[PDB]
């Protein structure tokens, strides 16, 4: 099922102190008598005062999309018919297509399944129709039986 | 103190509804059985709600702060819009604290909520459902005469 | 004290007991009903509202069994009752802070009584009254729990607790039912008020939450210094019941737990008369919330 | 039926976390200013864009030809700034800051009662002439290097307003005090704050304990009016309460909640006790 | 492929519930009034009782809470207008001197 | 039912390469037979190595607050009565107060509802009592029916 | 946010921001209500002997 994600707001971050790009400045006081006059006062205010101008630093991120992506991916992706993977580059691998190594070091591009697959549609992928959905990793029963023996 | 169930409802209406939908109430109150309580029933769709709010008069520092000057989360989100962030940091001004050692005197507001049902009133002598017909529906006074309804 | 202290997150981080359905040690003997996820407790706290100063208006039912459902008859009667004001009793917390010190309070303005009748026809009512008055139509009533209650102290690090009952008739008995309670928690009734008692968790001895039943070892019964009840050589170990074993050299545990078979058999029998024809999950209705098999958890 | 007045106490915290600038990072300090040795240092900020500064104030608008200037009580508002993201040139910025009198706290969970309908906060005082009035000061700054030259201009570039507010933390506590040295000092800026633990409070299940039970000292009485013969007898080793409890359990479904009797069931989360 | 040598720990939890012990010759709930009570009535005797509990150790004062399941009933009689008489009865552990 | 959020721990996003801010340095060895003193040793070591002093630099965020805030804005605020919204700036919208465009291109201040409202009190807002709570985008049955005809 | 009020292309812009459109489902009702006339003297249904 795919309703998209509810991400109508940004989640900017910020710097640890709230301000990093600060700028030094110095006290300024109006000169007496003559109008528009100015001069320097260093009696009480220290010579150097750090000050920021404008907004502060921040880095944007989209949360719900990332959470979904991650999920869809994990599950559906790393379980599509093998006819859709390809060997890794310059890394040792096994040859028997039924070992752990072969099922582990194979890789599969996320583009096959991402957060834009048949949007707004309740549906199941054709490649998955003829692949066992109990050899998944959420057979609550299988998980329980594995846990009860121990870790 | 005719309110009951910690809501703003008088006892009598509560009793009438309970009777008219479960023949329950003349012998206390309790939770009616599931199969006698379907989706559109009364009891499943009855929610009481209540809150406290600041008191305008008794507290002597009440200051009606409009929306255009509530600066909580001052420098970390947009202004009257979902747009980009802005603003500087600075302790806030809203809302008042209803807890802690410096609480402000408050008043209470209660209400209830009920939906997926229409209010029912049976035409019985004592509101108890006792069959597909009624006693009052057969008495001559309402069966061999004329009447006006208001 | 409970809010300003601090504990390093290294004790329980994402690398603890990985992949293992298991519960921490020090958490076993701490009541989990004292929490901020007791859906009942948060419901009851919200229902009054989120403020601090509240005018409240409630109706309290009557629960005594001997007058729970008694059908009264015409005439005049006197009805007199009492109520507590100790803030620490009636109020429930979520941590255990004694509210007297923290400074909570309650005050009563006025009490009123309510009653409901039936608009029954008069002649029928008189006839029913007269029929009910004949002494052959009295009213019988039986409490639900209906037992005798005794409490026995257990000092720190104790291992043995013997109890005695002086000679007495034993006509029409029913059996035993025991549990355990953690001092500082249990109150001390029998008077108008008490002090020397600070806490607020969830009086277990008085509401249900029970949570140390995971640590008894063995129970033995004797009659008149010679009988090992029930005797007659029934159980695997005739002399007494041993619930949980530490070290087993013969395989007396079942369900991969550390509970002896005999105790499982006895509990199943006394709950559902089940066990002389195999085992199987009892149906819903005969297994209510407070039942046994609903609350059985094996861990390893 | 009972009616009365209840005071839950000053430690009633029914919510997780806190509710004041929750987004703010847990170390960022408020714009402050302190003392050293023997002078004064300021840590500040200025988001608002102006037009032209003067000894009179900072321009905000134009009415005809007379320049208009901000009201010192509540301007500029802390939550107003430039919307455009790509930085540009600015020359007449302004900001707010608190004088050294008020103690310093982190921005996390920071409160100050508003003191005028416009929405500004500032400690009112009794003016020498019988009245109440605010006390704010204005500071002006220009570029440093731009001070190695005749006052040919020295035009001020940044304006600050200084204030003093009764800050307080209603629900959070300091989790790190670098040094016991009290008073305002440069060290205190390292402090961090943590929200208080959640803590509920209410009436028990089915109002247990409200009415006396099983105690000959205060046993209740139901009796015939003239006869005055007690109809209720109670013994003290009978716990009436575990009773209603289990009886309710059985003759029904406790999992649901009911209000009229405050019928709810104490129950933990199934995923807390077992991990 | 580099795991350490391990041992195992097993246990169980049963919060919210009370260990119980019925009084029958078969531990089967065959009625409100079990046989052994009637058999004792037949014998018409009296006896003393001893029990011994061995528990897990804890670093805190505790209490042992024991329930003897018994019979307890009330019967209420109402002869006239505005009067009510009652008779209690709890067995085996009675409570009245008359 | 606003319980607040659990945010007792911070969440820090770290730079990608572990560290970024770093200075250079140079090898040094003790000067023999002087009780102190030092000398350069570039015989087998680069004269310019990378080292960072102090804790690494990383930015902060608050997660649960942002998630709960997004949820509250997305599923509640938009549905407020039209009387409390306001027109946008410099964008054409239709005149008919019913068309989809007019509902879409309006705008409503997030400050009305956020994580600082009615804290701890199970409650429903007055402005929402008389608004139909059925014409809504999370209604499971309606969503099911819409999907069942495709997308 | 459309910083300006004119059109074409102008530094002025390149600063805008976007926002997704609200969701909106459309389909048949529950149990096809209104698909068949009822209680309408204009369109009374007929079931009778030929
Ligand atoms: Ca360098």
Coordinates of N, CA and C in Angstrom, one line a residue, chain C residues 2-3 20-23 27-28 32-33 36 38-40 42-45 48-64 67 76-84 89-95 97 99 102-112 114 144 149 189 191-192 203 206-207 211 288-290 299, chain D residues 1-12 14 16 173 194 196-215 218 220-225 232-234 236-247 249-252 254-255 257 259-262 264-269 272-275:
Chain C
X2 N 14.3 11.6 43.0 CA 14.2 10.8 41.8 C 14.2 11.5 40.5
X3 N 14.2 12.9 40.5 CA 14.2 13.6 39.3 C 15.6 14.2 38.9
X20 N 17.4 -11.3 21.6 CA 17.0 -12.2 22.7 C 15.8 -11.6 23.4
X21 N 14.7 -12.4 23.3 CA 13.5 -12.0 24.0 C 13.7 -12.3 25.5
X22 N 14.1 -11.2 26.2 CA 14.5 -11.3 27.6 C 14.3 -10.0 28.3
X23 N 14.3 -10.1 29.7 CA 14.0 -9.0 30.5 C 15.2 -8.8 31.5
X27 N 15.2 -5.1 36.8 CA 13.9 -4.7 36.6 C 12.8 -5.7 37.0
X28 N 13.2 -6.9 37.2 CA 12.2 -8.0 37.5 C 11.4 -7.6 38.8
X32 N 6.3 -2.8 37.5 CA 6.1 -2.1 36.2 C 4.8 -1.4 36.2
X33 N 3.9 -1.5 37.1 CA 2.7 -0.7 37.1 C 3.0 0.7 37.5
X36 N 4.8 5.6 33.2 CA 4.0 6.6 32.5 C 3.4 6.1 31.2
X38 N 0.9 3.4 31.8 CA -0.3 2.7 32.3 C -1.5 3.3 31.7
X39 N -2.0 2.7 30.5 CA -3.0 3.4 29.8 C -4.2 3.7 30.7
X40 N -4.5 2.8 31.6 CA -5.5 3.2 32.6 C -5.1 4.4 33.4
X42 N -3.0 6.9 32.7 CA -3.0 8.1 31.9 C -4.4 8.5 31.6
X43 N -5.3 7.5 31.3 CA -6.7 7.9 31.1 C -7.3 8.6 32.3
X44 N -7.0 8.0 33.5 CA -7.6 8.5 34.7 C -7.0 9.9 35.0
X45 N -5.8 10.1 34.7 CA -5.2 11.4 35.0 C -5.7 12.5 34.0
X48 N -9.5 14.1 34.6 CA -9.7 15.3 35.4 C -9.3 16.5 34.7
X49 N -8.4 16.5 33.7 CA -7.9 17.6 33.1 C -6.4 17.8 33.4
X50 N -5.7 18.7 32.6 CA -4.3 18.8 32.8 C -3.9 19.9 33.8
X51 N -4.8 20.6 34.3 CA -4.4 21.7 35.2 C -3.9 21.2 36.5
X52 N -3.7 22.1 37.5 CA -3.3 21.8 38.8 C -4.4 22.0 39.9
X53 N -5.3 23.0 39.7 CA -6.3 23.3 40.6 C -7.7 23.0 40.0
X54 N -8.3 22.0 40.6 CA -9.5 21.5 39.9 C -10.7 21.3 40.9
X55 N -11.9 21.9 40.5 CA -13.1 21.5 41.2 C -13.7 20.2 40.6
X56 N -13.9 19.2 41.4 CA -14.2 17.9 40.9 C -15.6 17.4 41.5
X57 N -16.2 16.6 40.8 CA -17.6 16.2 41.1 C -17.8 14.8 40.6
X58 N -17.9 13.9 41.5 CA -17.9 12.4 41.2 C -19.0 11.7 41.9
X59 N -19.3 10.5 41.4 CA -20.3 9.6 42.1 C -19.5 8.3 42.4
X60 N -19.6 7.9 43.6 CA -18.9 6.7 44.1 C -19.9 5.6 44.4
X61 N -19.7 4.4 43.9 CA -20.6 3.3 44.1 C -20.4 2.6 45.4
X62 N -21.3 1.8 45.8 CA -21.3 1.0 47.0 C -20.9 -0.4 46.6
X63 N -19.9 -1.0 47.3 CA -19.3 -2.3 46.9 C -19.5 -3.4 48.0
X64 N -19.9 -3.1 49.2 CA -20.1 -4.2 50.2 C -21.0 -5.3 49.6
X67 N -24.8 -5.9 51.1 CA -25.8 -5.0 50.7 C -25.6 -4.5 49.3
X76 N -38.6 3.2 56.9 CA -37.5 4.2 57.1 C -36.3 3.5 57.6
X77 N -35.1 4.0 57.2 CA -33.8 3.4 57.6 C -32.8 4.5 57.7
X78 N -31.7 4.2 58.4 CA -30.6 5.1 58.6 C -29.4 4.5 57.9
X79 N -28.7 5.4 57.2 CA -27.6 5.0 56.4 C -26.4 6.0 56.7
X80 N -25.4 5.5 57.3 CA -24.3 6.3 57.8 C -22.9 5.7 57.3
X81 N -22.0 6.5 56.8 CA -20.8 6.0 56.3 C -19.7 7.1 56.5
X82 N -18.5 6.6 56.2 CA -17.3 7.5 56.4 C -16.5 7.6 55.1
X83 N -15.5 8.5 55.1 CA -14.6 8.7 54.0 C -13.3 9.2 54.5
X84 N -12.2 8.8 53.8 CA -10.9 9.3 54.1 C -10.6 10.6 53.5
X89 N -3.4 8.1 50.2 CA -4.2 6.9 49.9 C -5.0 7.1 48.6
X90 N -5.9 8.0 48.6 CA -6.9 8.1 47.5 C -6.2 8.4 46.2
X91 N -5.2 9.3 46.2 CA -4.5 9.7 45.0 C -3.5 8.6 44.6
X92 N -3.3 8.4 43.3 CA -2.3 7.5 42.8 C -1.3 8.3 41.9
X93 N 0.0 8.1 42.2 CA 1.1 8.7 41.4 C 1.5 7.8 40.3
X94 N 2.7 8.1 39.7 CA 3.3 7.2 38.7 C 4.7 6.9 39.1
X95 N 5.3 7.5 40.1 CA 6.7 7.3 40.5 C 6.8 6.7 41.9
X97 N 6.3 9.3 44.8 CA 6.6 10.4 45.6 C 5.4 10.5 46.6
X99 N 2.9 12.3 48.5 CA 2.3 13.6 48.1 C 2.1 14.5 49.3
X102 N 5.2 16.7 49.3 CA 5.2 17.6 48.1 C 4.1 18.6 48.3
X103 N 3.1 18.4 49.1 CA 2.1 19.4 49.3 C 0.9 19.4 48.4
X104 N 0.2 18.2 48.3 CA -1.0 18.1 47.7 C -2.2 18.1 48.7
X105 N -3.4 18.5 48.2 CA -4.4 18.6 49.2 C -5.8 18.4 48.5
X106 N -6.8 18.2 49.4 CA -8.1 17.9 48.9 C -9.1 18.4 49.9
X107 N -10.3 18.8 49.5 CA -11.3 19.3 50.4 C -12.7 19.0 49.9
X108 N -13.6 18.7 50.8 CA -14.9 18.3 50.5 C -15.9 19.4 50.8
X109 N -16.8 19.7 49.9 CA -17.8 20.8 50.1 C -19.1 20.2 50.6
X110 N -19.8 19.3 49.8 CA -21.1 18.8 50.2 C -21.2 17.4 49.6
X111 N -22.0 16.6 50.3 CA -22.3 15.2 49.8 C -23.8 15.1 49.6
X112 N -24.2 14.4 48.6 CA -25.6 14.1 48.3 C -25.8 12.7 48.0
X114 N -28.3 9.6 46.0 CA -29.3 9.4 44.9 C -29.8 8.0 45.0
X144 N -17.6 -12.9 46.5 CA -16.9 -13.5 45.5 C -15.6 -14.1 46.0
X149 N -7.7 -13.9 55.3 CA -6.5 -13.3 54.9 C -5.5 -13.1 56.0
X189 N -3.3 -0.9 57.6 CA -4.7 -0.5 57.9 C -5.0 -0.7 59.4
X191 N -6.8 1.5 61.5 CA -7.0 2.7 62.3 C -7.4 3.9 61.3
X192 N -7.7 5.0 61.9 CA -8.1 6.2 61.2 C -7.0 6.7 60.2
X203 N -0.2 0.1 45.5 CA -0.4 -0.8 46.5 C -0.7 -2.1 45.8
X206 N -3.6 -4.6 47.2 CA -4.9 -4.0 47.3 C -5.4 -3.5 46.0
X207 N -5.1 -4.2 44.9 CA -5.7 -3.8 43.7 C -5.5 -4.8 42.6
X211 N 3.5 -8.8 41.3 CA 4.7 -8.9 40.4 C 6.0 -9.5 40.9
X288 N -10.2 -15.8 31.8 CA -10.4 -14.3 31.9 C -9.1 -13.6 32.0
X289 N -9.1 -12.3 32.3 CA -7.9 -11.5 32.4 C -7.0 -12.0 33.5
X290 N -7.5 -12.1 34.7 CA -6.6 -12.5 35.8 C -6.2 -14.0 35.8
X299 N 11.2 -17.3 29.2 CA 12.3 -16.5 28.7 C 13.6 -17.3 28.8
Chain D
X1 N -22.8 11.2 45.9 CA -22.3 12.3 45.1 C -21.3 13.1 45.9
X2 N -20.2 13.5 45.4 CA -19.2 14.2 46.1 C -18.7 15.4 45.2
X3 N -18.7 16.6 45.8 CA -18.1 17.8 45.1 C -17.0 18.4 46.0
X4 N -16.0 18.8 45.4 CA -14.9 19.4 46.2 C -13.8 20.1 45.4
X5 N -12.8 20.4 46.1 CA -11.6 21.2 45.5 C -10.4 20.4 45.7
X6 N -9.6 20.2 44.6 CA -8.4 19.3 44.6 C -7.2 20.1 44.1
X7 N -6.1 19.9 44.8 CA -4.8 20.6 44.5 C -3.8 19.4 44.3
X8 N -3.5 19.1 43.1 CA -2.7 17.9 42.8 C -1.3 18.1 43.3
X9 N -0.8 19.3 43.6 CA 0.5 19.5 44.1 C 1.4 20.2 43.0
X10 N 2.5 20.7 43.5 CA 3.4 21.4 42.6 C 4.4 20.5 41.8
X11 N 4.1 19.2 41.8 CA 4.9 18.3 41.0 C 4.0 17.5 40.1
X12 N 3.1 18.1 39.4 CA 2.2 17.5 38.5 C 2.7 17.8 37.1
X14 N 2.3 16.1 33.5 CA 1.6 15.0 32.7 C 2.1 14.8 31.3
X16 N 5.4 14.3 28.3 CA 6.8 13.9 28.0 C 7.5 15.1 27.4
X173 N 15.6 21.2 34.2 CA 16.7 21.4 35.2 C 18.1 21.3 34.5
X194 N 18.0 19.7 30.7 CA 17.3 18.5 30.5 C 15.9 18.6 31.0
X196 N 12.3 17.6 32.7 CA 11.9 16.8 33.9 C 11.1 15.5 33.4
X197 N 11.2 14.5 34.3 CA 10.5 13.3 34.0 C 9.0 13.5 34.0
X198 N 8.3 12.7 33.2 CA 6.8 12.8 33.3 C 6.3 12.2 34.6
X199 N 5.2 12.7 35.0 CA 4.7 12.2 36.3 C 3.2 12.5 36.4
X200 N 2.3 11.5 36.3 CA 0.9 11.6 36.4 C 0.4 11.5 37.8
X201 N -0.9 11.8 38.0 CA -1.5 11.7 39.3 C -3.0 11.7 39.0
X202 N -3.8 10.9 39.8 CA -5.2 10.9 39.6 C -5.9 10.1 40.8
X203 N -7.2 9.8 40.6 CA -7.9 8.9 41.5 C -7.7 7.5 41.1
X204 N -7.7 6.6 42.1 CA -7.4 5.2 41.8 C -8.5 4.6 41.0
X205 N -8.3 3.3 40.8 CA -9.3 2.5 40.1 C -10.5 2.3 41.0
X206 N -11.7 2.6 40.5 CA -12.9 2.4 41.2 C -12.9 3.2 42.5
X207 N -12.1 4.2 42.7 CA -12.1 5.0 43.8 C -11.7 4.3 45.1
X208 N -10.8 3.3 45.0 CA -10.4 2.5 46.1 C -9.8 3.4 47.2
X209 N -10.3 3.2 48.4 CA -9.8 3.9 49.5 C -10.5 5.2 49.9
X210 N -11.4 5.6 49.0 CA -12.1 6.8 49.3 C -13.1 6.6 50.4
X211 N -13.8 5.5 50.5 CA -14.7 5.2 51.5 C -14.1 4.0 52.4
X212 N -14.4 4.1 53.7 CA -13.8 3.2 54.6 C -14.3 1.8 54.4
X213 N -13.5 0.8 54.7 CA -13.9 -0.6 54.6 C -13.1 -1.4 55.6
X214 N -13.7 -2.4 56.1 CA -13.1 -3.5 56.9 C -12.3 -2.8 58.1
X215 N -13.0 -2.1 59.0 CA -12.3 -1.6 60.1 C -13.4 -1.3 61.2
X218 N -14.4 2.4 62.3 CA -15.3 3.3 61.5 C -16.2 2.5 60.6
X220 N -19.4 1.3 58.7 CA -20.6 1.9 58.3 C -21.9 1.2 58.8
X221 N -23.0 1.9 58.8 CA -24.2 1.4 59.5 C -25.4 1.6 58.6
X222 N -26.1 0.5 58.3 CA -27.4 0.6 57.7 C -28.4 -0.1 58.6
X223 N -29.5 0.5 59.0 CA -30.3 0.0 60.1 C -31.7 0.4 59.9
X224 N -32.6 -0.3 60.6 CA -34.0 0.1 60.7 C -34.1 1.3 61.6
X225 N -35.0 2.2 61.2 CA -35.0 3.6 61.8 C -35.3 3.4 63.3
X232 N -24.9 -4.6 59.2 CA -23.6 -4.9 58.6 C -22.6 -5.2 59.7
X233 N -21.9 -6.3 59.6 CA -20.9 -6.7 60.5 C -19.6 -7.0 59.6
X234 N -18.5 -6.4 60.1 CA -17.3 -6.6 59.4 C -16.2 -7.1 60.2
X236 N -11.8 -7.8 60.6 CA -10.5 -7.3 60.1 C -9.5 -8.3 59.7
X237 N -9.8 -9.0 58.7 CA -8.8 -9.9 58.1 C -9.5 -10.4 56.9
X238 N -10.4 -9.5 56.4 CA -11.1 -9.8 55.2 C -10.8 -8.6 54.4
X239 N -10.2 -8.8 53.2 CA -9.8 -7.6 52.5 C -10.9 -7.4 51.4
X240 N -11.8 -6.5 51.6 CA -12.9 -6.3 50.7 C -12.5 -5.9 49.4
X241 N -11.3 -5.3 49.3 CA -10.9 -4.7 48.1 C -10.4 -5.7 47.0
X242 N -9.5 -6.6 47.4 CA -9.0 -7.4 46.3 C -10.3 -8.0 45.8
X243 N -11.4 -7.9 46.5 CA -12.6 -8.5 46.1 C -13.3 -7.9 44.9
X244 N -13.7 -6.6 45.1 CA -14.4 -6.0 44.0 C -13.6 -6.3 42.8
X245 N -12.3 -6.2 43.1 CA -11.4 -6.3 41.9 C -11.6 -7.6 41.2
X246 N -11.3 -8.8 41.8 CA -11.5 -10.0 41.0 C -12.9 -10.2 40.5
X247 N -13.9 -9.7 41.3 CA -15.3 -10.0 40.9 C -15.6 -9.3 39.6
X249 N -13.3 -8.4 37.5 CA -12.6 -9.1 36.5 C -13.6 -10.1 35.9
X250 N -14.1 -11.0 36.6 CA -14.9 -12.1 36.0 C -16.2 -11.8 35.3
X251 N -17.1 -11.3 36.1 CA -18.4 -11.0 35.5 C -18.4 -10.0 34.4
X252 N -17.3 -10.0 33.6 CA -17.2 -9.0 32.5 C -15.9 -8.8 31.8
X254 N -12.6 -6.3 31.7 CA -12.0 -5.2 32.3 C -11.2 -4.4 31.3
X255 N -10.8 -5.0 30.2 CA -10.0 -4.3 29.2 C -10.6 -3.0 28.8
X257 N -12.8 0.7 29.3 CA -12.9 1.7 30.4 C -14.2 2.3 30.4
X259 N -16.6 5.5 32.4 CA -16.3 6.7 33.2 C -17.0 6.8 34.5
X260 N -18.3 6.6 34.5 CA -19.2 6.9 35.6 C -18.7 6.4 36.9
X261 N -18.1 5.2 36.9 CA -17.4 4.6 38.1 C -15.9 4.8 37.9
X262 N -15.4 5.6 37.0 CA -14.0 5.7 36.7 C -13.4 4.3 36.5
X264 N -11.4 1.8 35.0 CA -10.2 1.5 34.2 C -9.4 0.5 34.9
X265 N -8.4 0.0 34.1 CA -7.6 -1.2 34.6 C -6.2 -0.8 34.5
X266 N -5.5 -0.9 35.6 CA -4.0 -0.7 35.6 C -3.4 -1.8 34.8
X267 N -2.5 -1.4 33.9 CA -1.9 -2.3 33.0 C -0.6 -1.7 32.4
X268 N 0.4 -2.5 32.3 CA 1.7 -2.0 31.7 C 1.7 -2.2 30.2
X269 N 2.7 -1.7 29.6 CA 2.9 -1.9 28.1 C 3.5 -3.3 27.9
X272 N 7.5 -3.1 27.2 CA 8.4 -2.6 28.1 C 9.1 -3.7 29.0
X273 N 8.3 -4.5 29.6 CA 8.8 -5.5 30.6 C 9.7 -6.5 29.9
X274 N 9.3 -6.9 28.7 CA 10.1 -7.8 27.9 C 10.7 -7.1 26.7
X275 N 12.0 -7.2 26.5 CA 12.7 -6.4 25.5 C 12.8 -7.3 24.3

